[PDB]
């Protein structure tokens, strides 16, 4: 009695043969672009017949992580539960795109060494945009509420964002287009033999 | 994101959206993990992508910080039911193989799938505690009566028989292959497994 192999799994998940289970881990300041890259990437893989799944704020915040507030331990448990689920989707044969700020190198390496110890590729993607560009963009109003003292401890304002030193890609969203950053990430997945050339 | 409409075209080779949760529930040693294994081998044979949540990939991973106190079981299932919902939303057939004895935990698990629109199949693996105790596949029934395990379900914790499940499986009264086929017929009826 055993579970089905990743090789059999690699043959039934998509129309294109081979295991592709990996995890694409976006990280960056609120408003740097993680959501917009995630859909764009997700539309790409789907349009090219690669099943994927985004984990993001909307489908985690109020489900699996609904009992997790904004204390340091709670944001930590937040990235832990996301990481163990991303591993499961990866293990399932899918490409799992996570779009969480994840400000501390120390939770990101734990997520990475959760994947690497199951033999699953892990791609730290640094969505890099100057904080003042993020504060200008203010997509959800958060920076204005952080200045005002109504959001206490906000990444980039009152708690730090530890920038990836050694990530597989860096996306300079203040300098290039959405399509351009996606090309950087699709090309990564072609090198690592996830997306066929 | 990409709708379930378009995920049905890329996930699997069979065409159509199939995302759902087969949720096996019943006594420790009643055949949940056996059915989950054989059903998995069935769907992968028929080219239906799937994924199992069992004790192994959960106990020490996602739910590693959950004890065996009442709040912690509620949470155990709560987190499992959320992850099933994700794998179901993704276009996979998620199979869960936990005792999950309390009925409100199961009602909550179903609520989470239906409100999102995902099919939830409650599958009662049914075998008399005596046979399950007799089978004692892991040693737990032998430890439990001694008191090595306190609160074990069937001994010092109750088990709440699901009263309107989509299937009951007489693991003491029919073969693994018969019980798996009962689940296949339920999934063919609901346009999850092609004919
Ligand atoms: N190259 C780019 N990549 C991603 N987003 C960009 C880019 N250029 C401009 N933007 C804009 O930046 C904002 C990113 O917001 P969002 O994706 O919600 O950030 P986060 O990555 O924090 O979720 C969007 O308004 C998007 O239109
Ligand atoms: N119809 C059946 N379905 C599943 N298991 C069965 C059946 N009939 C007998 N068994 C036996 O019962 C035992 C079930 O144990 P297990 O699958 O570990 O159950 P659980 O996951 O509920 O603990 C196995 O040894 C299996 O061979
Ligand atoms: N350490 C943190 N400090 C402040 N806000 C956070 C932190 N972590 C996450 N957020 C906020 O989290 C929401 C995004 O979804 P979450 O699942 O809560 O976490 S997040 O990491 O992506 O940001 C947005 O409201 C996000 O901007």
Domain positions in chain B are 4-190
Give A157's contacts (C-beta < 8 A, 6+ positions apart).
A143, A146, A147
d(CA B42, CA B184): 9
d(CA A127, CA A29): 8
Q: Which residue among A2, A42, A87 places its CB closest to the CB of B1? A: A42
d(CA A114, CA B87): 19
B170 alpha carbon, distance to own chain's centre: 16
Task: Dump strand ranges (E) for chain A.
Answer: 22-27, 52-55, 95-99, 122-128, 169-172
Q: Which residues of B touch A13 (CB under 8 A)?
A: 11-12, 49
Hey, are the CB atoms on B89 and A14 less than 8 Å from each other?
no
Q: Which CATH number fits domain A6-192: 3.40.50.300, 3.30.540.10, 3.60.21.10, 1.10.150.530?
A: 3.40.50.300
Q: Record the tokens describing residue B132, joined without a space.
A: 């399950």
CATH of domain B4-190: 3.40.50.300
Hey, are the CB atoms on A51 and B49 less than 8 Å from each other?
yes
Q: Would you tell me the crossing angle of helices A72-91 and B70-89 to the nearest 10 degrees? A: 50
* One-letter-per-residue 3-state SS of chain B: CCCHHHHHHHCCCCCCCCCEEEEEEECCCCCHHHHHHHHHHHHHHCCCCEEEECHHHHHHHHCCCCCCCHHHHHHHHHHHHHHHHHHHHCCCEEEECCCCCCHHHHHHHHHHHHHCCCCEEEEEECCCHHHHHHHCCCCHHHHHHHCCCCCCECCCECCCCCCCCCEEECCCCCCHHHHHHHHHHHHHHCCCCCC
CB B187 within 8 A of CB B123: no
Rounded to the nearest angstrom, the minimum Cα separation between B14 and chain A is 9
Q: Which residues of B touch A54 (CB under 8 A)?
A: 1
If phi > 0 it is left, if psi is from -120 to 50 it is alpha, else beta; for residue B39 that is alpha
What is the whole-number distance in angstroms between the Cα of residue A112 and the centre of ligand 3? 19
Greatest CA separation found in chain A? 58
Q: Which residue among B2, B37, B48 places its CB closest to the CB of A46? A: B2
d(CA B122, CA B83): 16
Method by which the model was determined: X-ray
Instruction: Establish whether residue A145 lines the binding site of ligand 3, counting it when its CB lies within 6 angstroms of any ligand atom.
Output: no
Q: Record the tokens describing residue A83, joined without a space.
A: 């990481």
* Residue with token string 């993680």: A34
d(CA B189, CA B1): 29
* HSE (side-chain half, CA atoms, 13 Å) at B40: 26
Q: Which residues of B touch A14 (CB under 8 A)?
A: 10-13
d(CA B21, CA B113): 8
If phi > 0 it is left, if psi is from -120 to 50 it is alpha, else beta; for residue A33 that is left
Nearest 10 degrees: Cα torsion B169, B173, B174, B179: 0
Rounded to the nearest angstrom, the minimum Cα separation between B121 and chain A is 20
Give the DSSP H or E segment for A113.
helix A105-116
Q: Which residue among B33, B53, B83 places its CB closest to the CB of A64? A: B83
Rounded to the nearest angstrom, the minimum Cα separation between A135 and chain B is 25
Q: Which residues of B touch A92 (CB under 8 A)?
A: 49, 51, 87, 92
CB B32 within 8 A of CB B25: yes
Q: Choose one of A29, A30, A31, A33 to mutate for the ligand 1 pocket test, by most ligand atoms within 8 angstroms of C-beta.
A: A33
Hey, are the CB atoms on A12 and B10 less than 8 Å from each other?
no
């Amino acid at each position: 009695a055993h579970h089905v192999s990743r090789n059999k799994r690699g043959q039934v998940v998509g129309t294109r043969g081979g295991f592709r289970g990996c995890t694409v881990w976006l990280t960056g300041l609120s408003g740097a672009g993680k959501t917009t890259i995630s859909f764009a990437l997700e539309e790409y893989l789907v349009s090219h017949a690669i099943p994927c799944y985004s984990l993001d704020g909307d489908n985690v915040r109020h489900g699996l992580n609904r009992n997790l507030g904004f204390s340091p331990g709670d944001r930590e448990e937040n990235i832990r539960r996301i990481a163990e689920v991303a591993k499961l989707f990866a293990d399932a044969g899918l490409v799992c795109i996570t779009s969480f700020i994840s400000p501390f190198a120390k939770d990101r390496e734990n997520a990475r060494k959760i994947h690497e110890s199951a033999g699953l590729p892990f791609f730290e993607i640094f969505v890099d945009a100057p904080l003042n560009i993020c504060e200008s963009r203010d997509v959800k109003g958060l920076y204005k509420r952080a200045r005002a003292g109504e959001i206490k401890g906000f990444t980039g304002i009152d708690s730090d964002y530890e920038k990836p030193e050694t990530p597989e890609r860096v996306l300079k969203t203040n300098l290039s287009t959405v399509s351009d950053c996606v090309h950087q990430v699709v090309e990564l997945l072609q090198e690592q033999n996830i997306v066929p050339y």
